[PDB]
Design an enzyme around this catalytic site. Structure first.
Site, mmCIF file in Angstrom:
data_model
loop_
_atom_site.group_PDB
_atom_site.id
_atom_site.type_symbol
_atom_site.label_atom_id
_atom_site.label_comp_id
_atom_site.label_asym_id
_atom_site.label_seq_id
_atom_site.Cartn_x
_atom_site.Cartn_y
_atom_site.Cartn_z
ATOM 1 N N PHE A 151 -1.805 5.893 7.984
ATOM 2 C CA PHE A 151 -2.921 6.820 7.850
ATOM 3 C C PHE A 151 -2.892 7.474 6.471
ATOM 4 O O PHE A 151 -1.861 7.979 6.031
ATOM 5 C CB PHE A 151 -2.936 7.835 8.992
ATOM 6 N N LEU A 152 -4.024 7.438 5.770
ATOM 7 C CA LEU A 152 -4.164 8.231 4.555
ATOM 8 C C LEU A 152 -5.343 9.188 4.729
ATOM 9 O O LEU A 152 -6.382 8.799 5.266
ATOM 10 C CB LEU A 152 -4.276 7.382 3.292
ATOM 11 N N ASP A 204 -13.581 -6.291 -3.386
ATOM 12 C CA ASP A 204 -14.413 -5.250 -2.807
ATOM 13 C C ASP A 204 -13.885 -3.881 -3.205
ATOM 14 O O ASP A 204 -13.736 -3.000 -2.356
ATOM 15 C CB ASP A 204 -14.509 -5.354 -1.293
ATOM 16 N N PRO A 262 -15.109 3.149 -4.239
ATOM 17 C CA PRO A 262 -14.411 4.383 -3.874
ATOM 18 C C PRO A 262 -14.134 4.479 -2.380
ATOM 19 O O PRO A 262 -13.142 5.074 -1.970
ATOM 20 C CB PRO A 262 -15.343 5.480 -4.385
ATOM 21 N N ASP A 322 -8.846 -1.953 2.483
ATOM 22 C CA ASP A 322 -9.853 -2.883 2.954
ATOM 23 C C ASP A 322 -9.764 -4.220 2.222
ATOM 24 O O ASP A 322 -10.618 -4.548 1.394
ATOM 25 C CB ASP A 322 -11.234 -2.256 3.006
HETATM 26 O O1 LIG Z 1 -7.802 -1.406 5.008
HETATM 27 C C1 LIG Z 1 -7.960 -0.461 5.777
HETATM 28 C C2 LIG Z 1 -9.262 0.082 6.343
HETATM 29 C C3 LIG Z 1 -8.913 1.538 6.511
HETATM 30 C C4 LIG Z 1 -9.680 2.675 6.700
HETATM 31 C C5 LIG Z 1 -9.036 3.912 6.806
HETATM 32 C C6 LIG Z 1 -7.654 3.963 6.721
HETATM 33 BR BR1 LIG Z 1 -6.758 5.640 6.828
HETATM 34 C C7 LIG Z 1 -6.856 2.842 6.529
HETATM 35 C C8 LIG Z 1 -7.518 1.638 6.432
HETATM 36 N N1 LIG Z 1 -6.977 0.365 6.214
#
Ligand SMILES: O=C1Cc2ccc(Br)cc2N1
Ligand SMILES: O=C1Cc2ccc(Br)cc2N1
Ligand SMILES: O=C1Cc2ccc(Br)cc2N1
Ligand SMILES: O=C1Cc2ccc(Br)cc2N1
Ligand SMILES: O=C1Cc2ccc(Br)cc2N1
Ligand SMILES: O=C1Cc2ccc(Br)cc2N1
Lengths: 261, 266
Positions: B83-84, B128, B131, B146
């Site tokens: 998680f960020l 891709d 921001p 992503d």
């Molecule tokens: O690549 C992804 C898509 C995504 C959205 C949000 C968070 Br926090 C982590 C991730 N990992």
């Protein structure tokens, strides 16, 4: 130019060199398979060639699927009746990985002549992903060749074809080619192809990149020369047929050299 | 399988599936779950997922989002990610009036480049970068995320999928449909993003492919940026892909000679 990734070509070469060591199947996994043999694998790979050709797939795709099959059979006992299911799922996976426009699942079912259902193919796809733990980005012979061909002067489109051809011939034959790394097989093929067409041999520029000499590459070249020599006799003929076309300039029709060093 | 995870709230979506924030009940670790429905009677595991998973397994770098686990049910694929706190776009939006201090911009750009040079060094185009796909924590890190549109490339490159990169961030070699494209495309994106952290508004907000082209043309053929800043930007935004600065080269650039690592105003 940037297409040749100047700032990264080397870092990428090193990385591939290490990955090939880790994405490498068991040598003589086939001796521990009670129900299948080298000969059955040869039939399977040769069929994948023809599939690749029918669907106009990348050679890279074919190489990937073969890697996927050998690693899979390195871990899992498969009965004869199920070998083609492993191969079909492998080619599907490789197509999802590698191709802009992969064939749909229904086409992978079609080529198996309804031996297997769509459900079987899709379930095997998942099994294969599990057994490989989703490590699909395997370095191939083809990924080395494509690099090796940069150290040509000029580019000859006969040598390229002929190198691809030889590399593919090695896919068919678990014995002996399982004991050689893709990078080593790739070199052997480059040389053989050059010699056959130009008379020139393994470039110096490529000695410095790889650390491979005609010395280190001797066993493989021997085996490859043999394979090249005997190709018209071999039970499997899809690769020769493939390379008779104008697309690949017709290099499977060339005569092998009688000798090297 | 998923008994240990507690859903906290939804945090995004896509053809990818649904993205939830979640808590491990045993460890207390907060994660993001991407739920990927499998088409078990039609298409099977989507090619996007096969690439995202396999490429993210290989890439372990402090500035690439960490894939922690993959949970294989028969019907669903769950991707467990670190998680960020949020994405750069939300940070930019929240910063529209106040601005983003220049030390942060430098740090963020330095990290993005480190992340991307690792991608490039390992045969991987991201394809891709924008921001919305870059994530930040409270401690001053930013990471590439992503990897759904990413691709393992060969040397030299072959023709790859044309329909790559969100319009605003798409390099000219793609807009014009050049037979070949390479690492340069990702640098262009980071170029656009750099400009965007400074102004907090997109550099090339085209309405269509032609509008995009024209915006790029009139601009190449940002007030608060120093001379070094402006130099690097223009090398990241070079028209010629062959002439465009590389990630590796850009890490040397003088702009970064004084780089630190600030925490952001969250
Ligand atoms: O690549 C992804 C898509 C995504 C959205 C949000 C968070 Br926090 C982590 C991730 N990992
Ligand atoms: O089962 C068979 C019979 C057959 C014919 C042709 C090709 Br190519 C492969 C195979 N395998
Ligand atoms: O009917 C066929 C044709 C064929 C090609 C390849 C393999 Br493996 C098995 C089979 N069986
Ligand atoms: O890429 C590779 C490595 C390798 C090992 C064995 C055989 Br048979 C074929 C291949 N092709
Ligand atoms: O056992 C293995 C072989 C292997 C190949 C690639 C990656 Br990533 C991880 C692993 N672990
Ligand atoms: O079961 C699996 C296969 C797999 C692939 C990738 C990652 Br990260 C975790 C796992 N666990």
């Amino acid at each position: 130019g940037v297409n040749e990734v100047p700032d990264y070509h080397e870092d990428i070469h090193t990385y591939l060199r290490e990955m090939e060591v880790k994405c490498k199947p068991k040598v003589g996994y086939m001796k521990k398979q009670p129900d299948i043999t080298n000969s059955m694998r040869a039939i399977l790979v040769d069929w994948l060639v023809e599939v690749g050709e029918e669907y106009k797939l990348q050679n890279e795709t074919l190489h990937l699927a073969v890697n996927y099959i050998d690693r899979f059979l390195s871990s899992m006992s498969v009965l004869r009746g199920k070998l083609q299911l492993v191969g079909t799922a492998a080619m599907l996976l490789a197509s999802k990985f590698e191709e802009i426009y992969p064939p749909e699942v229904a086409e992978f079912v079609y080529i198996t002549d309804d031996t297997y259902t769509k459900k079987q193919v899709l379930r095997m796809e998942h099994l294969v992903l599990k057994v490989l733990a989703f490590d699909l980005a395997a370095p191939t012979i083809n990924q080395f060749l494509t690099q090796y061909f940069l150290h040509q002067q000029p580019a000859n489109c006969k040598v390229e074809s002929l190198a691809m051809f030889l590399g593919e011939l090695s896919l068919i034959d678990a014995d002996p080619y399982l004991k050689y790394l893709p990078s080593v097989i790739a070199a052997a093929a480059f040389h053989l192809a050059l010699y056959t067409v130009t008379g020139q041999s393994w470039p110096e520029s490529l000695v410095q990149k790889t650390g491979y000499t005609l010395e280190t590459l001797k066993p493989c070249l021997l085996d490859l020369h043999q394979t090249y020599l005997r190709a018209p006799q071999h039970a499997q003929q899809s690769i020769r047929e493939k390379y008779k076309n104008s697309k690949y300039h017709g290099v499977s029709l060339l005569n092998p050299p009688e000798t090297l060093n | 399988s998923m008994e240990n995870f507690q859903k906290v709230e939804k945090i995004g979506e896509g053809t990818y599936g649904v993205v939830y924030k979640a808590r491990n009940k045993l460890t207390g670790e907060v994660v993001a779950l991407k739920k990927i429905r499998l088409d078990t009677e039609t298409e099977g595991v989507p090619s996007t997922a096969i690439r995202e998973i396999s490429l993210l397994k290989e890439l372990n770098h402090p500035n690439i989002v960490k894939l922690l686990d993959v949970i294989h049910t028969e019907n669903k694929l769950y991707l467990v990610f670190e998680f960020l706190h949020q994405d750069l776009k939300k940070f930019m939006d929240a910063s529209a009036l106040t601005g983003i201090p220049l030390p942060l911009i430098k740090s963020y750009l330095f990290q993005l480049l480190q992340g991307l040079a690792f991608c490039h060094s390992h045969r991987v185009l991201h394809r891709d970068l924008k921001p919305q796909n870059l994530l930040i924590n409270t401690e001053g890190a930013i990471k590439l995320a992503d990897f759904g549109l990413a691709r393992a490339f060969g040397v030299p490159v072959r023709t790859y999928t044309h329909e790559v990169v969100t319009l605003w961030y798409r390099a000219p070699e793609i807009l014009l449909g050049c037979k070949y494209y390479s690492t340069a495309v990702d640098i262009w994106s980071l170029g656009c993003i750099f400009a965007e952290m400074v102004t907090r508004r997109a550099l090339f907000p085209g309405d269509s492919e032609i509008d995009q082209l024209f915006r790029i043309f009139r601009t190449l053929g940002v007030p608060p940026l120093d001379e070094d800043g402006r130099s690097l930007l223009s090398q990241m935004l070079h028209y010629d892909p062959n002439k465009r600065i590389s990630a590796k080269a850009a890490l040397a650039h003088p702009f970064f000679q004084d780089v630190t690592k600030p925490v952001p105003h969250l």
